[PDB]
Design a protein around this nucleic acid. Structure first.
Lengths: 747, 51, 676
RNA sequence: GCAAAAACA
RNA sequence: GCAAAAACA
RNA sequence: GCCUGUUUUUGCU
RNA sequence: UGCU
RNA sequence: AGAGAAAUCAAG
C-alpha cells in the first residue's frame, strides 16, 4: 500500500545516516557536485572480452531468485557454489535468457504496450511513409542542422524543465514555474507517460519525456528542396546518389502563427512608430494559455513575419533573403547592400519615389533555386563571375533574372523606367515580365564567347551546345554553402525592418511592404482581448466576446471605452464597435443613457454588472448611425450585424449572461463571485518554514480554491502567494516611467 | 476525463474533438489538421497496411 | 600503388580510402619512455637559435627572440614580443563580436562554472598517491586536501576551487589525512613541485605514425586553472571565421565549404601541417596574447592574474622522466637515470629534479589546443594576408585568391613568416600548395568536387561492443546508420557492413553453428525468434533505426505470448538488487517504491571476472545521491537548491511527504517516530 | 475502422 | 549527469 | 598501462 | 570441441 | 629459439 513507500524511504534515510555519518554534513547544494562521483563503473575494452566472457562457464551475474531452476533438463542453469558475497553474487548460465524466452512468467499486455511505446511509434512512422520511386542523380550536399526525431510538441529550451516539473511533480512547483510551462505539452506528456511511468523509473521516464519534447538538432548533409524535416529517415530517403520521393505536409501551426504575426505587423505599421506598438501588443496576446513571447520562442521558423516578431522579442530569425523563388545569402561583402531613393519626375504632379537596393564594393553571394545551386561575385553593379551547379538542359531564366534583380546589375529598370512608375509591386512585375520576354540584358551585361567549354548557352540553358557561350560563367568547381561563424544578432528598425549587424553598417534582412502573403486562419486559442487590435478576428462573435472580456474584467479600460464612445474620441476598438452594431438610429439615446448613468453613479466602475450595462450603452453609442432617419429610443436588446446572436442590456440571455453567482460572456464564465483570480496574485514571501496560512497541494490547486493566502513547496522553501491589490501590472508601470523619463529628456 | 477506453477508438481522439469544438466556437467550422488526426480518420492507413 | 590510381572512372581522391591498413593491428609501445621524454625536452632548446646551442638555451626563462634570430630554414622556438602584441591588437580590433562573447562569458558564464566539470577527465596524475588515478578520485581527494588544509568548505564554483588552490600555496606546511590512518607531509616547495609535475606515459594503439610518441597528464592543482582559459578560448573560437577546432563533423565541412570560393585569376589552396608543435610554443606568448585580449576588453586585474596562472605553471613544468635510459655492456640490458653515465642528453642533467626534468620552453603537451589555435589565428590578421585561413591546432588549410602567381607566392611566404613570428613553424615536407584551387585536405578530409567519403575510418567501430545483445545490436546499427548519413558508406557498403556486423554479432553470442547455447535451444525446442538467438535478420538497410523487438512485433515475427515473457519487468535475469522509485501521474500518492527489473531479459550483465577507501567513499556518495533522488524528484529536472545540510533537508522533505500521504494522523505519528 | 463474399481508408 | 565505443588533431 | 580538445553512436541513472 |  | 622494432614479452 501507500505506507510501504514511506517505510522504505524511512529505512533508506536511517541507513544512509548510519552508514554515511559524513556526506550529509555537506550542504544539499553539494549534490550537484557529488552526484558525478560514480567511479567503479569504469571499464576498458569490453569488446575485447565479449567472445571469452560469453563462453565462460558462468557468464551472467544476477540476483538470487527462485524462478530459475537449479537444473533444467540436465543443464545447470545457475551456480551457487561460491556465494562470496551471497548478494548479487549467484551466477547464471548463458542459456538462462534463452530458457526464460519460454517457460517463464508473463506480464499484462498493457505493460508490453507501454514499454515499446516510442519504438512502436518509430516503427509505425516508418511503415506509414509513402515509399516513393528512387531518382538516381548527382547531388551537391547542403550541410545543415536537422532535428533528430519528431517531437509531440515543440517547446523552447527554457520552458522544458518547467514543463517536466508540471508533468511529473506538480506538488514541488511554484506559480512562476507553472506559468513558464507549456500546458499543452504538459497535458500531452501526462497522457503519454500515464502508462509509461508504471514500467520506467523516475529518471528514465523524465528523460523519455524530455526526448519527446526536445529538438536535439544535428548537422547532416541534406538535399535542397528535399528536407525530410527530421533525420530519422535520411539513410533511407537520401544519399549522394539518390533520393526517395515522399509526400509529407508540414502539419504544423507555424503557418497560422505567421498569419497572426502578419496581421499584427500590418496593423502596427498604420500607427505612430510601429516598433513599440508591436512590442506592447505581443506582450498582451496569448495563444491558448501561453503568452505570445513564449510561443514565438517555441517556433523558430524561416518565415518573414514570424522572424519580425521574434526579433521584436529579442530572439533570432533564420529567414533568408528571397526573390520570387530564389534564396540569396551573402557569403562576404565589403559593405551592406545600400538603397537608392530613385525619384521619378515623369509628371510634375504625379511622381513616385521607388527605391532599389544594390552593392557597393566587392561582394560574393550564394544563390539557390530548386536544384540550381551556386554563387556569384560582383563589384558594385557589375557581375564579375558566376558559378552554377545545375542539372543538364535545365532552364536558368528565373534564377539568373532573380540574381540580376538582387544585384541591380542589368539596367533597363531600377534607375530607368522602360516605359510612368506607379508603386513597387507594379514596377517589379513589369521588370520581371519585360526581362522574361526580352532576356538580352543578361547577355549584353556578361558578354559572349565562342568557347565550347563554357556551359551556359545564350538562351540561358545549362550545357546545351551553341555557337556562342555566355562569358565568365563556369561550372561550380568546389562545393559552396553559406555558413555564419559569429552568432548573428538582429536589429529591428523603427518601421519594423529587420537588420543584421554587418561590420560597416546594417544589412537588411526582412522588409515589410513587399512581403506578399494572403490572409490565413489564426492559431486556435488566440486571445486578442488585451491587445489594441481586436478587429483581427474575422468572426463577429469572437470580436464581441474579446471586446466584452476587455471591458468587463478591467475598470480602467471600461472607463476609457465609455469616455471615448460618449465624447466621440478616437478609440482602439472603433472598427470592432462599428462592425458589431448594425446601421441604426439609437446613438443619441445611448449617449443620453450614458449621461444619466454617469451622473447618477460616479462610482459605477466597480460593479461588473454596471460595467456590462455601460459597455452595452457605449457599444450602441459608437455605432454607425443613419442620417435620413429620426433618432429613436435605445432598445433593451439588439442583434449583431450579419448574425443571429442577441446582445442584451439586462444580460439575461444571449451573448452576456450575468447570473447572481457568476457572469458568462460568450458561453465562458469570465468572473466568479467568490472563487476567481481576475486581478491575479503576487508572490509576497519566501520562507524555509511553513507560513501561517493554508498549504495547497499544487499551484493549480490553489488557483482554483481562490484563497486569500496559500503556500506552495519548492525544494525546501515555501512561497506564500496572497493577492494583488494594485490596479496596474508591472509592465505598463515600467512603460509609463520609461516614457516619462524620455518625455522629460526631449526638452 | 476518459472512463472507458477501446482499442478500436483510442482516447487521443478527444484532442481532435476538443480542437473541433474550439474552432467551431471561434467561427471556423473547418480547421487545420493536427497530429492526433493521424489516427482518427485513417490517414495513410491504406499505405500503412499495404506496406 | 598503381592499382590505387584510377584514370578513367573515378579519381585518386575517391581511392584515398584505400591508403588505410586499418583492420590490421595497431602499433604499440613496449619499453622505456625516457628517450622520447628527453627528446621532447631537448628539442625546444635545439630550435631557439639558428645554430643549435643547447647549453646557451637552458638559462633562458622567457623565450623571446629578435626578428633576425628567427630561423626561416628550420624550426624556430620562441616568439617576437612586439609581433605578439601587435598581432593580438589586430585580432582584437577585428572580430569584435567574438570579444563581446568573451566579455559575456567572463561576466555571466564564468561565475557559474562548477569545479565538478573537472571530473569529466580521464586518468589524472595524483600529487598525493604519486600515481595516475581517475579524475573523480583525484578531484575528490584534492578537494578534501584543500578543505582540511584551509579549515573551510570549498564552494561549488570553479573560481572558489582556484582561489583555494592559490591559498594553499601560501601555507608553509600542508598535510593530508585519509582513510586506508596514513599521513603525508608537503612543504611549500614539495607541493609546488607536485603542482608543476606532468606524468609522462606512452600512447598505445595510435595509427598513422612510424615512431611512438609520449603523452602526459597534469595534476588536479592545475587542471582547474587550465579549464577557465580553455573555456574562454572556446568561446572566442566559436565566433571567428578562421577557426576550425571548436566545430566538427558536418559543421566543420560546411564551414570549410563556405570558404571554397575561387573566383580570381590565380586561386591557390595550401594545405599543410605545423612541425614540432606543442614544443615550439612558449607559454609566455599565450600569456601575452591573453593579457592583450583582457586589456583591450577593459577587464580588471584579478581575471588577468587568473588567466596567467596556468601558463606560468607550465613555464615551470616538471616532466616526469621514465624508468631510465637503456644501457648495455655486452648483451645485457640495464635501465639507468639520466645523470648516471654519459648519453646524448648530458646537457639536460642540470634540469633534473628528482625523477622529473624541467623545461622552460615549449608546452610538452596538448593542454592548450584552443589557446594555441588562438595564437595561430592572431598571426594571420595582417594587411598582407588576404586569403581564407582555417586552423584547428596544428593542421591548417589556406585558400588564396590573387591576381598573379607572384602575389600568391608572396602571400604564402608572408603566411609562413607570420606563423614563425609566434613560434609556429610550417612543416615544409607536409605543406603542399596547388596553384589552381579545388584539391586539398584538412583533418584527413580530402575534397576534389565535394568532401569524399572515407571508408576504413568507420571499420574499427564495426566490432560488437560487448555489453549485451540488445545494446550491441542497437549501437552497431546506429553507427552504421550515422556512417551512411554522413556519406562515408553508401547503400552497398552500408548493407555489407550490416551483414558483417550481424554475422560477427551472432558469432560472439554463440548463435552460429553447434554451440552450448544452440544445443540447449535445440534439445529444449526453443525457437530463436531473435537475431542474437540465431533467427533470420529482421533489420534492413532502411530499418537500421528501428528497434528489433518492436519491428518483430509489428511484422508478426514475435507473437504476443513470447512478448509477455521477454519484456517482463520482473524477470530474474535483469532484476535489480534494490527497490527503485516510480512516478504516478495524477495519483493520490505520486511516488511508489518497488522492486524493478530491466524489461528485456537479454539486457543481462556480464561478470567482469576480477585508493580503496576512496572507493568506499564513492559508494557512500552513491547511496546519498540515491536517497536524495528518491526524496527529491525535482532535482532530476533542475539543479539542487534546497537550503541547509543534506540531513535536515531530507528530514523535512520526508516529513512533508508523510503529512501529504493521506493516512491516519496516528499512523503518520508512528512513521515519524522512527525517523532518525 | 466502414462494410460483407471485396470496395474505401 | 554518468558509462562504453569510434574518428580527427 | 590507457593525456588534452572537438565531433559522433549507444545504454543506464 | 562447429562463423564459410 | 621466436614474436618484434628505436625496446619489451618469452614467469614468480
Amino acid at each position: 500500500e501507500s505506507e510501504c513507500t514511506l517505510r522504505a524511504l524511512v529505512e533508506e534515510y536511517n541507513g544512509a545516516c548510519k552508514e554515511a555519518p559524513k556526506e550529509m554534513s555537506k550542504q544539499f547544494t553539494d549534490y550537484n557536485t557529488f552526484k558525478r562521483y560514480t567511479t567503479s563503473k569504469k571499464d576498458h575494452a569490453p569488446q575485447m572480452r565479449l567472445v571469452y566472457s560469453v563462453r565462460k562457464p558462468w557468464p551472467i551475474s544476477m540476483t538470487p531468485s527462485k524462478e530459475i531452476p537449479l537444473v533444467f533438463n540436465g543443464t545447470k542453469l545457475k551456480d551457487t557454489i561460491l556465494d562470496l558475497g551471497e548478494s548479487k553474487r549467484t551466477r547464471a548460465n548463458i542459456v538462462v535468457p534463452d530458457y526464460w524466452s519460454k517457460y517463464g512468467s508473463q506480464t499484462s499486455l498493457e505493460v508490453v504496450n507501454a514499454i515499446l511505446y516510442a519504438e512502436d511509434l518509430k516503427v509505425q512512422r516508418f511503415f506509414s511513409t509513402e515509399w516513393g520511386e528512387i531518382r538516381y542523380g548527382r547531388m551537391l550536399p547542403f550541410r545543415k542542422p536537422v532535428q533528430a526525431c519528431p517531437t509531440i510538441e515543440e517547446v523552447n529550451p527554457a520552458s522544458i524543465p518547467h514543463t517536466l516539473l508540471q508533468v511529473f511533480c506538480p506538488q514541488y512547483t511554484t506559480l512562476d514555474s507553472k506559468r513558464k510551462a507549456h500546458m499543452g505539452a504538459v497535458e500531452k506528456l501526462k497522457r503519454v507517460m500515464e502508462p509509461i511511468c508504471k514500467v520506467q523509473t523516475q529518471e528514465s521516464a523524465v528523460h523519455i519525456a524530455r526526448s519527446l519534447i526536445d529538438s536535439n538538432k544535428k548537422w547532416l548533409p541534406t538535399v535542397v528542396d528535399h528536407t525530410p524535416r527530421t533525420a530519422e529517415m535520411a539513410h533511407f530517403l537520401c544519399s549522394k546518389y539518390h533520393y526517395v520521393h515522399t509526400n509529407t505536409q508540414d502539419l504544423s501551426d507555424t503557418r497560422s502563427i505567421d498569419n497572426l504575426c502578419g496581421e499584427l505587423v500590418k496593423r502596427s505599421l498604420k500607427c505612430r512608430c510601429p516598433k513599440e506598438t508591436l512590442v506592447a501588443n505581443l506582450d498582451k496576446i496569448t495563444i491558448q494559455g501561453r503568452p505570445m513571447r513564449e510561443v514565438l520562442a517555441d517556433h523558430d521558423g524561416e518565415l518573414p513575419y514570424l522572424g519580425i516578431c521574434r526579433v521584436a522579442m529579442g530572439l533570432s530569425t533564420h529567414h533568408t533573403m528571397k526573390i520570387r523563388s530564389t534564396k540569396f545569402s551573402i557569403l562576404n561583402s565589403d559593405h551592406p547592400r545600400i538603397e537608392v531613393k530613385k525619384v521619378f519626375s515623369l509628371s510634375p504632379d504625379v511622381q513616385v519615389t521607388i527605391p532599389y537596393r544594390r552593392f557597393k564594393g566587392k561582394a560574393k553571394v550564394y544563390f539557390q533555386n530548386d536544384q540550381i545551386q551556386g554563387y556569384f561575385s560582383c563589384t558594385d553593379r557589375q557581375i564579375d563571375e558566376i558559378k552554377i551547379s545545375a542539372p543538364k538542359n535545365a532552364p536558368l531564366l528565373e534564377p539568373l533574372l532573380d540574381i540580376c534583380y538582387y544585384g541591380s546589375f542589368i539596367e533597363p529598370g531600377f534607375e530607368q523606367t522602360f516605359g510612368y512608375p506607379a508603386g513597387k509591386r507594379e514596377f517589379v512585375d513589369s521588370f520581371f515580365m519585360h526581362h522574361s520576354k526580352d532576356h538580352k540584358a543578361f547577355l549584353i551585361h556578361m558578354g559572349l564567347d565562342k568557347d565550347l567549354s563554357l556551359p551556359l548557352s545564350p538562351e540561358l540553358n545549362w550545357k546545351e551546345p551553341a555557337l556562342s557561350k555566355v562569358c565568365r560563367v563556369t561550372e561550380l568547381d568546389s562545393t559552396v554553402q553559406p555558413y555564419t561563424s559569429a552568432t548573428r544578432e538582429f536589429v529591428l528598425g523603427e518601421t519594423l525592418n529587420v537588420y543584421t549587424q554587418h561590420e560597416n553598417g546594417l544589412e537588411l534582412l526582412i522588409c515589410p511592404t513587399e512581403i506578399r502573403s494572403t490572409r490565413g486562419p489564426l492559431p486556435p486559442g488566440t486571445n486578442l482581448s488585451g491587445s489594441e487590435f481586436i478587429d483581427i478576428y474575422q468572426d463577429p462573435f469572437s470580436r464581441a466576446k474579446s471586446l466584452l472580456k476587455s471591458t468587463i474584467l478591467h475598470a480602467e479600460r471600461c472607463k476609457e471605452f465609455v469616455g471615448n464612445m460618449l465624447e466621440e474620441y478616437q478609440d482602439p476598438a472603433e472598427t470592432t464597435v462599428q462592425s458589431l452594431v448594425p446601421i441604426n438610429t439609437w446613438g443619441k439615446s445611448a449617449k443620453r443613457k450614458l449621461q444619466e448613468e454617469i451622473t447618477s453613479d460616479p462610482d459605477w466602475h466597480q460593479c461588473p454588472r454596471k460595467r456590462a450595462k455601460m459597455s452595452y450603452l457605449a457599444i450602441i453609442a459608437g455605432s454607425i448611425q443613419d442620417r435620413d432617419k429620426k433618432q429613436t429610443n435605445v432598445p433593451r436588446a439588439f442583434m449583431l450585424r450579419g448574425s443571429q446572436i442577441e446582445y442584451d442590456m439586462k444580460a439575461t440571455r444571449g451573448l452576456v449572461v450575468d447570473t447572481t453567482n457568476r457572469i458568462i460572456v460568450g458561453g465562458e464564465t469570465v468572473l466568479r463571485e467568490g472563487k476567481g483570480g481576475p486581478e491575479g496574485y503576487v508572490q509576497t514571501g519566501v520562507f524555509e518554514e511553513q507560513p501561517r496560512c493554508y498549504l495547497v497541494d499544487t499551484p493549480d490547486h490553489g488557483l482554483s480554491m481562490g484563497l486569500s493566502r496559500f503556500c506552495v513547496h519548492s525544494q525546501g522553501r515555501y512561497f506564500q502567494y496572497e493577492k494583488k491589490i494594485s490596479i496596474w501590472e508591472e509592465t505598463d508601470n515600467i512603460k509609463a516611467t520609461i516614457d516619462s523619463q524620455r518625455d522629460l529628456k526631449r526638452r | 476525463e476518459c472512463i472507458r477506453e477501446s482499442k478500436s477508438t483510442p482516447a487521443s481522439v478527444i484532442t481532435c474533438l476538443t480542437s473541433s469544438l474550439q474552432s467551431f466556437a471561434e467561427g471556423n467550422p473547418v480547421r487545420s489538421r493536427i497530429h492526433e488526426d493521424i489516427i482518427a480518420f485513417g490517414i495513410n492507413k491504406k499505405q500503412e497496411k499495404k506496406q | 600503388m598503381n592499382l590505387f590510381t584510377p584514370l578513367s572512372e573515378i579519381n585518386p581522391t575517391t581511392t584515398q580510402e584505400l591508403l588505410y591498413a586499418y583492420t590490421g593491428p595497431a602499433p604499440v609501445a613496449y619499453g622505456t619512455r625516457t628517450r622520447a621524454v628527453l627528446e621532447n625536452i631537448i628539442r625546444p632548446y635545439q630550435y631557439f637559435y639558428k645554430e643549435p646551442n643547447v647549453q646557451r638555451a637552458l638559462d633562458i626563462k622567457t623565450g623571446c627572440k629578435e626578428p633576425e634570430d628567427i630561423n626561416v630554414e628550420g624550426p624556430s622556438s620562441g616568439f617576437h614580443t612586439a609581433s605578439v602584441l601587435k598581432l593580438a591588437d589586430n585580432f582584437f580590433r577585428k572580430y569584435r563580436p567574438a570579444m563581446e562573447k568573451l566579455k559575456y562569458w567572463i561576466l555571466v558564464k564564468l561565475p557559474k562554472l562548477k569545479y565538478a566539470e573537472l571530473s569529466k577527465g580521464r586518468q589524472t596524475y595524483s600529487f598525493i598517491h604519486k600515481r595516475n588515478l581517475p579524475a573523480p578520485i583525484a578531484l575528490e581527494e584534492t578537494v578534501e586536501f584543500l578543505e582540511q588544509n584551509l579549515r573551510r568548505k570549498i564552494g561549488p564554483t570553479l573560481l572558489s576551487y582556484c582561489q583555494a588552490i592559490a591559498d594553499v600555496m601560501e601555507l608553509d606546511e600542508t598535510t593530508y589525512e585519509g582513510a586506508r590512518t596514513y599521513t603525508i607531509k608537503f612543504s611549500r616547495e614539495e607541493l609546488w613541485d607536485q603542482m608543476r609535475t606532468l606524468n609522462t606515459m606512452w600512447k598505445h594503439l595510435e595509427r598513422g605514425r612510424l615512431n611512438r610518441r609520449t603523452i602526459a597528464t597534469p595534476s588536479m592543482l592545475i587542471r582547474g586553472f587550465v579549464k577557465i582559459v580553455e573555456d574562454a578560448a572556446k568561446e572566442i573560437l566559436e565566433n571567428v571565421p578562421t577557426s576550425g577546432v571548436p566545430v566538427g563533423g558536418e559543421e566543420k565541412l560546411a564551414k570549410l565549404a563556405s570558404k571554397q570560393t575561387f573566383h580570381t585569376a590565380v586561386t591557390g589552396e595550401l594545405s599543410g601541417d605545423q612541425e614540432k608543435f606543442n614544443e615550439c610554443l612558449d607559454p609566455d606568448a599565450m600569456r601575452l596574447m591573453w593579457t592583450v585580449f583582457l586589456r583591450k576588453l577593459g577587464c580588471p586585474d584579478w581575471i588577468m592574474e587568473l588567466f596567467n596562472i596556468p601558463f606560468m605553471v607550465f613555464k615551470s613544468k616538471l616532466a616526469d622522466m621514465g624508468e631510465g635510459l637503456v644501457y648495455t655492456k655486452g648483451k645485457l640490458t640495464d635501465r639507468k637515470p639520466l645523470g648516471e653515465m654519459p648519453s646524448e642528453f648530458d646537457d639536460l642533467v642540470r634540469n633534473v629534479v628528482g625523477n622529473s626534468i624541467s623545461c622552460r620552453l615549449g608546452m610538452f603537451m596538448g593542454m592548450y589546443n584552443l589557446t594555441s589555435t588562438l595564437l595561430a589565428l592572431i598571426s594571420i590578421e595582417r594587411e598582407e594576408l588576404t586569403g581564407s585561413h582555417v586552423e584547428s591546432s596544428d593542421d591548417f588549410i589556406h585558400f588564396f585568391n590573387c591576381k598573379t602567381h607572384e602575389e600568391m607566392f608572396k602571400q604564402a611566404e608572408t603566411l609562413r613568416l607570420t606563423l614563425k613570428l609566434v613560434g609556429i613553424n610550417m612543416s615544409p615536407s607536409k605543406c603542399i600548395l596547388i596553384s589552381p584551387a579545388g584539391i586539398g585536405e584538412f583533418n584527413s578530409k580530402f575534397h576534389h568536387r565535394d568532401f569524399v567519403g572515407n571508408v576504413a575510418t568507420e571499420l574499427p567501430a564495426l566490432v560488437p561492443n560487448g555489453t549485451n545483445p540488445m545494446t550491441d545490436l542497437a549501437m552497431g546499427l546506429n553507427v552504421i546508420k550515422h556512417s551512411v548519413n554522413t556519406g562515408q558508406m553508401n547503400l552497398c557498403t552500408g548493407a555489407l557492413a550490416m551483414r558483417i556486423f550481424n554475422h560477427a554479432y551472432k558469432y560472439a553470442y554463440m548463435a552460429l553453428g553447434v554451440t552450448r547455447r544452440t544445443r540447449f535451444m535445440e534439445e529444449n525446442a526453443i525457437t530463436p525468434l531473435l537475431t542474437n538467438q540465431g533467427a533470420s535478420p529482421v533489420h534492413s538497410f532502411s530499418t537500421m533505426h528501428l528497434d528489433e523487438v518492436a519491428l518483430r512485433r509489428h511484422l508478426g515475427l514475435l507473437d504476443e505470448e513470447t512478448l509477455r515473457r521477454i519484456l517482463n519487468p520482473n524477470n530474474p535475469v535483469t532484476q535489480k538488487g534494490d527497490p527503485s522509485m516510480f512516478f504516478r501521474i495524477e495519483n493520490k500518492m505520486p511516488q511508489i517504491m518497488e522492486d524493478y527489473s530491466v524489461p528485456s531479459c537479454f539486457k543481462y550483465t556480464l561478470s567482469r571476472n576480477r585508493h580503496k577507501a576512496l572507493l568506499n567513499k564513492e559508494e557512500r556518495y552513491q547511496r546519498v545521491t540515491s536517497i536524495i533522488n528518491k526524496l527529491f524528484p525535482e532535482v532530476l529536472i533542475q539543479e539542487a537548491s534546497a537550503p541547509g545540510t543534506v540531513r535536515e533537508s531530507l528530514k523535512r522533505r520526508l516529513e512533508l511527504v508523510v503529512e501529504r500521504s493521506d493516512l491516519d494522523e496516528e499512523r503518520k505519528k508512528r512513521i515519524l517516530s522512527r525517523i532518525f
